[PDB]
């Protein structure tokens, strides 16, 4: 999945 700060 995506990192904590992604998007």
């Amino acid at each position, epitope marked *: *999945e995506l990192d*904590f*700060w992604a998007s």
Partner: antibody
Amino acid sequence: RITLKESGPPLVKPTQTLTLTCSFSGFSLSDFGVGVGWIRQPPGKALEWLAIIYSDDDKRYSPSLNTRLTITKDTSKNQVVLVMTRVSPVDTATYFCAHRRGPTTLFGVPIARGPVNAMDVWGQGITVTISS
Amino acid sequence: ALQLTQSPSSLSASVGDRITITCRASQGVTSALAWYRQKPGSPPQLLIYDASSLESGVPSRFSGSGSGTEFTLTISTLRPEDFATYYCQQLHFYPHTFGGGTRVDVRR
């Protein structure tokens, strides 16, 4: 100044459980968006990411080691603990814990996440040998 | 999972050279990439964060560029303390992968 230091048993036998402790100073695991992760390095090999925990208590693990790892934090003692179960010889490596910065803020408002893209301060690392 | 490939795996150089190490990821990782220098018996040290930002206290000879799937670290004027192993780390997807590393040693 941020500093971290790993502690635990230098020797562990196969099938046993390994508990590693990261004690730190200079930041709190109650600080906004902060993280503490664990990385290992078998002798002569590359770095391998293991897990990370954030102050809001979100936890993430290496998929390959997921079933054997548990990471937890004790905010009041400024410690992060990593528990690895059923270790085997391939787990002998130097284990490092490291700090991950939260976003830059202005008047308590995050304005830059760029700082989170790295583990900026590392502990000296602790050597763990797994042998019966 | 995501793959991070460093090139070259090993590299020879001399004090004063300009070297460039590159790291390619299998899927785009935006700018979430960091570079570290590791001297034997020592922990990795952060050089560049967020693909190109110079970490505080790190000498200017270090530079990082790139985004997406291709990144490069260049040391403009190699110093003796730079003979070491360098690693790139991706922090866009979990797990936060490290590259295989590239060893920079004294050429002869």
